[PDB]
């Protein structure tokens, strides 16, 4: 798949379709979605990492939304990005 070719897990196709639905430009570069897919998979990686960190801060393996919130607390730049 294109995601595997890009070295990404998250869907390049869904990113491209979400980009399409906004009609953000008259023609689309194949680099735009792949790049963005990687950016958002990076945000997922960072958020998740802090989320697991918080979960273990809660002495456990299972994350729930409170623990995502404390993950956002643990990293101020996500705090200002997500509010």
């Amino acid at each position: 798949s294109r995601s595997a070719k890009a070295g990404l897990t998250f869907p390049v196709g869904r990113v491209h379709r979400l980009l399409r639905r906004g009609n953000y430009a008259q023609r689309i570069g194949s680099g735009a979605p792949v790049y963005l897919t990687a950016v958002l998979e990076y945000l997922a990686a960072e958020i998740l990492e802090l989320a697991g960190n918080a979960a273990r801060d809660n002495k456990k393996t299972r994350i729930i939304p409170r623990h995502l919130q404390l993950a956002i607390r643990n990293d101020d730049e996500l705090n200002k990005l997500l509010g």
Partner: protein
């Protein structure tokens, strides 16, 4: 166990031969069963056709809901969970003149296809451009001629700028004999040659054109290049076999392409159209 099989007495061996014969007779009975199921499925397709036709008219906006059907839809909404359809006070203040500015369902079949798991992954944005003009998807069972089912995609020539064909169709064929499990087994498929308005509007190839005062051949010549590309409309024109190339190259071709083609066709015919409304809204997932 070959040792055991050799160990079986002769008498048990003709017994097993007769049992194999009984299995074969059951195979012919399965063939008749499949014939009867195909005939009755075609009959029920004929039974189905008007309701698909009516919902297609609704999808295209050619027909307007009548308040009995509106009320029946409302009471179905009250069942399970479809409260999205309950009309609010704000919309009742609207007028048909404002609402009918957009006629039909925008990108109904596009979203219905792109909600289908296996098929959606093949639809590029260039393909999706044509699917915007898709307004109907019909099924036809090849009762006449070789057995199979044919998929129909409909368009408006006066609307779409890509091709002059109002209807694009894809065909699947089965072999004359049933499979080992008793289900139908497939034969090579065929697809229609789309009458593209121009090669620029073609979606299944990439072109390059260039002019050279070619010093090598003393030719002031123009060169055009055409290269097939991956696209959903490659679903049509399926591969065919040439014996010498079939043995080496097209063996892997039939191993890969035919499986995906048949799976996509089966998914469409079974999952999609009977629940096209639910696939459109995603409730069929």
């Amino acid at each position: 166990d070959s040792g055991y099989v050799g160990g079986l007495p002769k008498n048990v061996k003709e017994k097993l031969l007769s049992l194999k014969t009984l299995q074969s007779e059951l195979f012919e009975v399965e063939k008749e069963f499949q014939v009867e199921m195909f005939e009755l499925e075609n009959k029920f397709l004929q039974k189905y056709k008007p309701i698909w036709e009516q919902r297609s008219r609704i999808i295209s906006g050619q027909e307007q809901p009548k308040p009995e059907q509106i009320a029946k839809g409302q009471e179905i909404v009250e069942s399970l969970n479809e409260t999205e359809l309950l009309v609010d006070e704000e919309e009742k203040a609207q007028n048909d003149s404002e609402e009918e500015q957009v006629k039909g369902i925008p990108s109904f079949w596009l979203t219905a296809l792109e909600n289908l798991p296996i098929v959606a992954d093949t639809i590029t944005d260039r393909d999706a451009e044509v699917l915007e003009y898709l307004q109907d998807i019909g099924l036809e069972y090849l009762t006449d001629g070789r057995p199979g089912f044919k998929l129909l995609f409909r368009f408006d020539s006066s609307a779409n700028p890509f091709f002059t064909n109002d209807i694009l169709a894809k065909t699947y064929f089965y072999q004359k004999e049933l499979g080992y499990s008793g289900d139908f087994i497939y034969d090579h498929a065929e697809g229609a040659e789309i009458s593209w308005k121009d090669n620029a509007h073609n979606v299944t190839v990439d072109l390059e054109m260039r002019k050279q005062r070619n010093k090598t051949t003393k030719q002031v010549r123009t060169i055009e290049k055409i290269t097939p590309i991956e696209s959903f409309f490659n679903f049509f024109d399926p591969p065919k076999i040439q014996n010498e190339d079939q043995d080496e190259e097209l063996e892997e071709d039939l191993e890969e392409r035919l499986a995906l083609d048949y799976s996509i066709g089966e998914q469409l015919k079974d999952k999609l159209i009977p629940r096209a409304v639910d696939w459109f809204t995603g409730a069929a997932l």
